[PDB]
Structures are given as structure tokens and as C-alpha cells.
Amino acid sequence: LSPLALNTMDQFSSRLIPINYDQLKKLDAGKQIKLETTQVSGNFGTKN
Amino acid sequence: IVGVGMEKLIISTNEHASTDQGKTVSRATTNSKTESNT
């Protein structure tokens, strides 16, 4: 399957992630954006 | 004992910039008639 898209930053998924003008001038110059995971939340299963 | 430390601050200027260019072509015609009596 294809990867999922992370393109909203607010809690209700109604606001796109923006970048600054100088950040765009960096992006079109060949500089890449790296992704770092800081923490992951999740659940485990038990028996009632 | 939890504390927060800032490493750097980033400023995003909230400006709006526009650029407009135009072109025009025009044409006129005049019919002038003059009478002189003396």
C-alpha cells in the first residue's frame, strides 16, 4: 500500500502545515527536510 | 524538577506582496472640417 499523508497540524485536521518564504527559498535550492520521531503513544490489550 | 530551555527563535514576517504588468493597444480616427469666410 501507499504511505499515508501527514498534511494537517491542528487537532481537527482542518489546517494545513505552512512554511515561511525563506524556508521555501531553501526548499527550492535543493535542501531537504528531515523527519524525526520524538515519541509514540499506543495501547496494549488485557482481559476483563 | 522540570524546566524548559529555548534553543532558537524563528520569525516569519507577515507581509503581502503583489506584482502587476499590463499592455494596451489603441487606435483613433478624426474627421475635422473647417469653413472660413472673409
**Segment (H or E) for A24:** helix A21-27
**What experiment produced this structure?**
cryo-EM
* Residue B14 at interface with chain A, using a CB cutoff of 8 Å: no
Contacts of B13 in chain A (CB under 8 A): 21
- Cα nearest neighbour of A23 on chain B: B12
Resolution, angstroms, 1 dp? 2.6
* Residue A20 at interface with chain B, using a CB cutoff of 8 Å: yes
Single out the residue of A30, A2, A6 nearest to residue A17, CA to CA.
A6
Is A26 exposed, middle or buried (CB count within 10 Å of its CB: 0-12, 13-18, 19+)? middle
Cα of A48 to nearest chain B Cα, Å: 36
Count CB-CB contacts under 10 A for residue A17: 9
Whose grid coordinates read 520521531?
Answer: A37
